[PDB]
Amino acid sequence: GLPKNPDLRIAQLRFLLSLPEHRGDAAVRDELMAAVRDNNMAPYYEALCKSLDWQIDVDLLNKMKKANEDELKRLDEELEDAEKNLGESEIRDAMMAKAEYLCRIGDKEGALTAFRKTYDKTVALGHRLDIVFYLLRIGLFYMDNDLITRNTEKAKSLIEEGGDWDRRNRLKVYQGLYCVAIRDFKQAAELFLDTVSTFTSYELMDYKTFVTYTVYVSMIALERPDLREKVIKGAEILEVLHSLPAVRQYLFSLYECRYSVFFQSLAVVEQEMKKDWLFAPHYRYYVREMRIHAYSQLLESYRSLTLGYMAEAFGVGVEFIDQELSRFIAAGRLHCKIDKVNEIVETNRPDSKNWQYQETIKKGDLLLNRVQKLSRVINM
Amino acid sequence: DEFEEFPAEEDAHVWEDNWDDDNVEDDFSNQLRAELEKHGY
Amino acid sequence: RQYYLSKIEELQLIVNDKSQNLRRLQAQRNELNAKVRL
Amino acid sequence: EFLHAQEEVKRIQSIPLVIGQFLEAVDQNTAIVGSTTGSNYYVRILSTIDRELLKPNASVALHKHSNALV
Amino acid sequence: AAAEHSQRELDTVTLEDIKEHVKQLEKAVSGKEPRFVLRALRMLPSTSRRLNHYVLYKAVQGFFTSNNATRDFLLPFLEEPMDTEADLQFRPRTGKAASTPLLPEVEAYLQLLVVIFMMNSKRYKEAQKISDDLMQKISTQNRRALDLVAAKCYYYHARVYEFLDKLDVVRSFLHARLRTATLRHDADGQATLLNLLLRNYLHYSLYDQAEKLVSKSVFPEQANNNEWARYLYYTGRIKAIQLEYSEARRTMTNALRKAPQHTAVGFKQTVHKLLIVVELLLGEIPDRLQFRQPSLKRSLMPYFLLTQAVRTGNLAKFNQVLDQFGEKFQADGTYTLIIRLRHNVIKTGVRMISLSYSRISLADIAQKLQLDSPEDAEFIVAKAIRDGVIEASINHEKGYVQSKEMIDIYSTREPQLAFHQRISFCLDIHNMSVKAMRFPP
Numbered sequence: 001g002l003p004k005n006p007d008l009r010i011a012q013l014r015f016l017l018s019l020p021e022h023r024g025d026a027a028v029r030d031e032l033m034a035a036v037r038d039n040n041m042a043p044y045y046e047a048l049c050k051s052l053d054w055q056i057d058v059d060l061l062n063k064m065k066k067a068n069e070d071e072l073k074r075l076d077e078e079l080e081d082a083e084k085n086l087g088e089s090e091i092r093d094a095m096m097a098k099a100e101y102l103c104r105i106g107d108k109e110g111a112l113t114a115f116r117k118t119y120d121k122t123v124a125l126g127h128r129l130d131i132v133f134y135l136l137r138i139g140l141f142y143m144d145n146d147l148i149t150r151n152t153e154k155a156k157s158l159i160e161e162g163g164d165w166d167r168r169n170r171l172k173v174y175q176g177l178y179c180v181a182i183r184d185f186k187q188a189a190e191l192f193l194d195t196v197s198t199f200t201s202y203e204l205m206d207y208k209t210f211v212t213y214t215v216y217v218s219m220i221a222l223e224r225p226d227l228r229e230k231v232i233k234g235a236e237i238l239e240v241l242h243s244l245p246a247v248r249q250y251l252f253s254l255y256e257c258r259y260s261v262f263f264q265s266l267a268v269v270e271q272e273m274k275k276d277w278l279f280a281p282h283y284r285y286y287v288r289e290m291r292i293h294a295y296s297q298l299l300e301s302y303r304s305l306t307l308g309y310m311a312e313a314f315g316v317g318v319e320f321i322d323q324e325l326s327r328f329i330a331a332g333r334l335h336c337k338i339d340k341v342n343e344i345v346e347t348n349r350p351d352s353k354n355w356q357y358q359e360t361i362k363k364g365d366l367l368l369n370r371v372q373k374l375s376r377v378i379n380m
Numbered sequence: 381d382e383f384e385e386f387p388a389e390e391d392a393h394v395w396e397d398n399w400d401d402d403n404v405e406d407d408f409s410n411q412l413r414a415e416l417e418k419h420g421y
Numbered sequence: 422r423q424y425y426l427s428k429i430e431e432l433q434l435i436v437n438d439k440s441q442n443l444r445r446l447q448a449q450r451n452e453l454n455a456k457v458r459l
Numbered sequence: 460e461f462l463h464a465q466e467e468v469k470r471i472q473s474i475p476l477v478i479g480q481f482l483e484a485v486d487q488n489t490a491i492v493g494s495t496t497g498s499n500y501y502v503r504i505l506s507t508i509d510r511e512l513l514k515p516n517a518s519v520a521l522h523k524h525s526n527a528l529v
Numbered sequence: 530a531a532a533e534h535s536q537r538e539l540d541t542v543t544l545e546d547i548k549e550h551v552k553q554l555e556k557a558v559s560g561k562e563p564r565f566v567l568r569a570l571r572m573l574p575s576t577s578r579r580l581n582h583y584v585l586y587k588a589v590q591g592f593f594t595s596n597n598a599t600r601d602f603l604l605p606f607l608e609e610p611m612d613t614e615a616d617l618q619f620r621p622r623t624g625k626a627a628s629t630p631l632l633p634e635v636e637a638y639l640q641l642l643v644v645i646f647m648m649n650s651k652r653y654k655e656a657q658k659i660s661d662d663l664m665q666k667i668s669t670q671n672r673r674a675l676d677l678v679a680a681k682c683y684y685y686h687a688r689v690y691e692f693l694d695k696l697d698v699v700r701s702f703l704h705a706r707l708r709t710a711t712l713r714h715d716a717d718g719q720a721t722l723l724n725l726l727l728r729n730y731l732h733y734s735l736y737d738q739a740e741k742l743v744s745k746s747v748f749p750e751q752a753n754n755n756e757w758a759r760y761l762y763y764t765g766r767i768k769a770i771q772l773e774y775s776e777a778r779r780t781m782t783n784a785l786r787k788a789p790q791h792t793a794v795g796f797k798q799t800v801h802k803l804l805i806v807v808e809l810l811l812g813e814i815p816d817r818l819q820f821r822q823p824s825l826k827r828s829l830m831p832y833f834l835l836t837q838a839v840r841t842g843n844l845a846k847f848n849q850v851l852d853q854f855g856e857k858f859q860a861d862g863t864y865t866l867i868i869r870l871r872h873n874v875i876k877t878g879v880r881m882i883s884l885s886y887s888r889i890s891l892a893d894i895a896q897k898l899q900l901d902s903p904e905d906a907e908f909i910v911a912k913a914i915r916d917g918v919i920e921a922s923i924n925h926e927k928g929y930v931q932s933k934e935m936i937d938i939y940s941t942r943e944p945q946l947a948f949h950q951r952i953s954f955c956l957d958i959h960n961m962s963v964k965a966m967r968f969p970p
Contacts, residue, residue: 145394183395267409274407281393287408288400316415326885331400339888341929346887354939364951369786375958376754379965380564381574381755383793385688385728389828399817402837426671431714434673437561445966457461 002133002170004203005104006141008277010035010044015277017052022275040067044106068105075101092121096131103138111138112147125162132158133167136174137203140181148178166200173201173210180217183282189214189221197236211240212247216269216279219251220289224297228255259294260315266290291324292333299336299347307343318343471505472529476520481513481528492519492528500526537615540584546576547588547642548621554634557674566634566677567717573638573681577645582608585646591619592639594627599636602662603643606655633675637667641682644689653692660686676710680718687725696729703729711746720752720760727763731862736770743767758787762800769807769866775917778807791824798828799861805832806866810873812880812918814840831857835867839874842899847871875900879913883921883932891928903928 013032016022036045042064049056075098082090099114112135119131132155139147155171176191192214199210218231231237232255241248250265252258266287273283298313299305310321325345328334336347350358405411479494488506490513493499502521504513505528513519519528550569557565586609593599620627640663647656664686667679683706690696707722723746730739748760761784768777781804788797801819808815819825820833831854838846851871858864878898882889889897895906910930913919921932938944 145392263412267412270407271409282395285398285401291408311419315419316412317419320411320415327400329885330881331398337887337932338885340886340893341888341890348935351937354937357939357944361947368951368954371958372954373754373787375962379961380567381571381753381789381792383755383759383789383796385691386793386795386799388794389798397817397821399814399840403841430671430673440561441967442964444970445964445968448966448968453461457464 001166001200002130002137002203003100005100005134006106006137007035007039008137008141008204010041011141011143012277014048015280016275017048019275023052036064039104039106040064041104041106042068043108043110047106071101072098088121088123092118092123092127095121096127099131100134103134108138108142125158126164126167129155129158129167133170133174140174140177140204143181145182148181152178169195169198170201173199173204176213176217177204177278180213180282181278183285185217185282185286186221189217192217193230196234208240208244211237212244213279215241215247215251216273216286219254220286220293224255254290254294254297257297259298259313262294263314263316266294292328295325295328295334299334299345300349302347304344304346307338307345310345468505468507471522471527472507472520475523476529477523477526478518479521479526479528481515481517481519483515484510484513490528492521492526494521494526502527504528536581537583539579540581540587541617541619543576543579543584544587544591544619546572547639550576551592551621551635551638554638554674554678555632558632558634563674563677566674569634569638570677570681573641577649580642580646580649582646583610585642586610587619588639588642591621592635593631594620594622595630597630599631599640603640603659606643606647606659633667633670633672634678637663637675637678637682640666641678641685644682644685648685648689648692651692653689656689657693660689671713673713673715676713676715676718680715680721683718684721684725687729696732700726700729707746716749716751717753717756720749720756723748724756724759724763727760727767731763731766736767739763740767740771754787755789758784758789758796758800761787762796762803765807766803769803769810774807774810778804778811778813781807794824798825801825801829802832802861802863803866805829805836806863806870809836809839809870809877810866812873812876814877835870839870839877842874842878844871844874847874875909876913876918879910880918883913883919883930887932888929891923891930894930 010032013028013035016028017025017032022028032048035041037060042061045061045064046056048054075094079091079094079098082094095114095118099111099118102114103111115131115135115138119128122128122131132151136148136151136155138144139151152171152175155167155174159168159171172191172195176188176195179185179188179191192210196211196214199207201210204210205213215231215237218227222231231251241251246265246268249261250269253262253265270283270287273279273286276283279286294314295310298310307318307322307325310316310325311318314321322338322340322343325334325336325338329336329338335349336345338345477494477496479492479496479500482491482493482499484490485501487510488504489501490504491499491501500521502525504510508528513528521527522529550572553565553569557563557569585607586604589600589603589607593603640659644656644660644663647653647659660682663682667675667682683703687696687699687703690699703722703726707719707726710718710722723742726742727739730736730742743764748757761780765777765781765784768774768780771777781800785797785800785804788800805815805819815836820829820836831850834850834854835847838844838850848871851867855864855867858867875898879894882894882897886893891903891906891910894900894910895903898906898909900906900909907923907925907928910919910921910923914921914923919932921930923930
């Protein structure tokens with residue numbers, strides 16, 4: 001529905017180029033250069049050249065600059081014609097076209113100011129929503145946290161005043177993408193599960209990419225019952241996963257307690273996640289949380305198990321499983337303790353009463369601190 | 381009731397980061413590959 | 422001479438707090454008596 | 460004395476009681492109830508009973524002597 | 530210029546504010562309640578700003594004006610406005626009101642305004658004379674309410690001597706004034722004087738003297754949360770230096786909890802620094818969030834590096850951060866504690882091993898803690914067990930460290946004791962809240 005400008009594939013390719021092991025890659029360079037030359041994207045060409053210390057082609061750069069200049073002159077001429085002869089609708093459309101071209105040619109600040117001016121002149125609620133969505137897309141393209149937050153708030157408010165279900169679903173997809181960008185995986189899983197059945201924001205990513213993101217985030221966020229009900233038994237999710245054997249194996253290995261295959265698939269998923277432009281900083285966190293999740297899931301069904309049993313189940317050595325278990329217990333993530341003399345992990349899961357008492361102590365301590373502060377404030 | 385006697389004297393990320401994030405180590409894929417080839421032979 | 426000043430000062434503060442406590446007790450009793458009468 | 464008064468208040472709604480039909484609320488702690496005896500009485504209401512349960516048709520239990528809704 | 534007119538407007542609204550404050554002081558005098566005084570000194574810091582030379586000149590020419598020596602003492606210390614067109618005669622006291630001598634509250638408050646304004650002008654010597662005269666005047670006064678005001682100026686007095694860099698020509702005077710407050714059974718004055726004296730002691734590094742006094746003197750519970758926080762911070766520093774690390778950590782945690790939400794950035798930063806250092810001494814890794822707060826990020830960044838170095842177990846990183854930023858610790862007054870942590874890092878590793886494992890052998894402990902010999906591991910683990918950091922016992926017959934098996938605490942008396950403390954606090958809170966009830970006549 002909405003136009004694919006700006007292309008997030010361009011941002012993904014740029015991030016991949018910025019990566020060390022893919023900095024020397026050529027196919028990424030070829031695809032990015034083809035996209036730029038199909039789009040005549042000069043300012044972003046300069047930005048990429050200065051960020052990556054690239055050798056700028058003077059002929060191509062000059063051709064791009066001349067094309068951009070003549071096109072901008074054309075849009076200005078159409079805007080003047082609409083102002084002189086036509087009503088506010090045609091000048092509005094001309095200004096939207098100018099802003100769209102500015103965003104297309106990779107100008108960030110120019111596109112921002114043009115879209116802001118258009119929004120100032122925009123009256124139709126649907127067109128305000130479209131402009132806000134364009135600003136959100138630009139912010140996602142440049143990973144501008146403040147811009148994304150402000151435009152998300154604006155879109156939410158606009159939809160609350162008047163919101164069609166299509167734009168609300170699209171805003172849900174954008175919010176899920178941003179939540180992924182800020183490691184807020186629970187909300188991202190919520191939104192992706194809500195939008196998987198009616199995903200229409202193809203400008204952000206393909207359906208398969210969205211489904212892979214949904215599977216990953218739901219795995220890291222949902223517990224076992226919710227994961228089984230909404231993801232394992234998900235209709236559309238299973239339908240698309242029929243065409244993604246790797247993601248399907250990764251998802252089903254943990255649910256079926258096939259921990260060695262799960263670990264191998266998690267290594268594959270980490271390798272995929274490192275190259276992703278959006279899941280970039282959270283790959284270590286995601287992997288650590290998945291390892292903790294697998295360890296806790298295995299230990300939930302056992303009171304005391306030999307370290308060799310985990311080594312065989314996860315397909316690793318005794319030393320590696322011991323080191324990871326010790327590190328995660330030291331961080332207070334697993335309810336167990338290790339007997340290295342016998343090499344037996346004994347779970348220390350608190351009973352219902354003990355956990356309830358500890359939660360009561362914590363919550364009551366917080367509430368009593370608040371009460372003491374309030375009383376000392378008011379009693380002078 | 382400010383405490384003026386004591387004078388009041390990049391990485392702008394929003395997400396809460398845990399101590400383990402600062403810990404340096406090889407990638408989990410590398411560790412798994414190493415353990416797999418160690419236990420394979 | 423400072424005897425009298427110190428003694429009357431401490432007595433003034435204790436009688437002040439006692440009068441305040443008496444007033445609040447008076448009000449509490451009045452509420453209770455209103456409930457009983459109702 | 461307040462505890463004693465509450466005990467007396469509870470003692471008011473004691474066996475035996477006469478069933479009547481709550482005809483119509485008049486104001487706070489005051490109503491008209493049609494007793495099963497065959498006569499309608501303008502009676503008082505104890506503050507204990509919630510004023511929302513007194514439907515204009517729901518049956519009520521009244522003091523045998525004073526016919527007051529209890 | 531209209532800028533001077535707007536300055537005059539804000540000046541006269543400050544005049545209205547100080548008129549309201551002195552009215553509250555007189556209402557406290559004539560109302561037999563000191564809480565109005567506390568409210569006046571609570572509004573005092575807000576109006577400590579927004580003032581200039583003419584504000585205080587018009588204040589002292591509106592009040593006093595009884596031809597007393599007070600005028601001869603405070604007028605020469607500040608400048609005077611010219612023959613302004615707006616000669617609005619600001620006279621809160623009319624006739625008999627100006628005839629009667631000023632109450633100690635109002636004169637103390639205005640002289641306090643003089644000294645704080647003089648301090649804001651950064652000429653400490655001029656404020657020294659006015660502070661000395663103020664406390665010569667209020668020394669003889671035995672008014673209970675004035676003590677509150679006295680308390681505040683007490684602090685300010687010490688404050689000015691901080692800019693005079695002496696802090697010692699007045700130590701005996703603060704001792705005597707604290708003793709006078711103690712025999713007067715005052716709460717606010719005693720607490721603030723204890724806090725100022727402790728600050729002086731720590732500024733001159735007399736930690737033994739401070740420990741002796743805090744052992745002898747008793748901090749009044751019914752004091753300001755601000756003064757409580759300062760006293761808790763100073764006591765935590767004392768206990769940290771005295772090696773009483775756990776009590777120091779608890780006291781500093783309480784001080785941080787009682788910090789004025791977001792009002793004292795510097796005090797919170799210092800408390801966070803000391804708390805992080807002492808928690809590291811205990812072997813506990815502090816909260817990460819402390820380092821990511823907007824106000825405490827850069828201040829605790831060297832402490833972030835220190836915590837990372839010790840948690841990673843890289844003593845080379847510890848020495849490196851000592852070389853670069855360790856000198857800053859000397860400015861922060863924590864260098865000795867940082868050296869103690871440099872030589873006590875291994876306690877954190879022992880605590881980690883105890884937390885993770887339950888029957889780890891001595892050889893494995895030495896391997897995982899970089900200890901050269903298993904006997905050294907035995908010595909370290911035994912010392913850590915004795916010093917209340919570990920809950921294990923070493924079966925020396927075959928060399929395994931068995932942690933004390935976890936018993937169902939809810940089946941023990943510990944929950945009863947915790948609930949007893951909570952119930953006592955709740956009942957005391959109810960008793961305090963119902964006890965005042967402030968029903969006016």
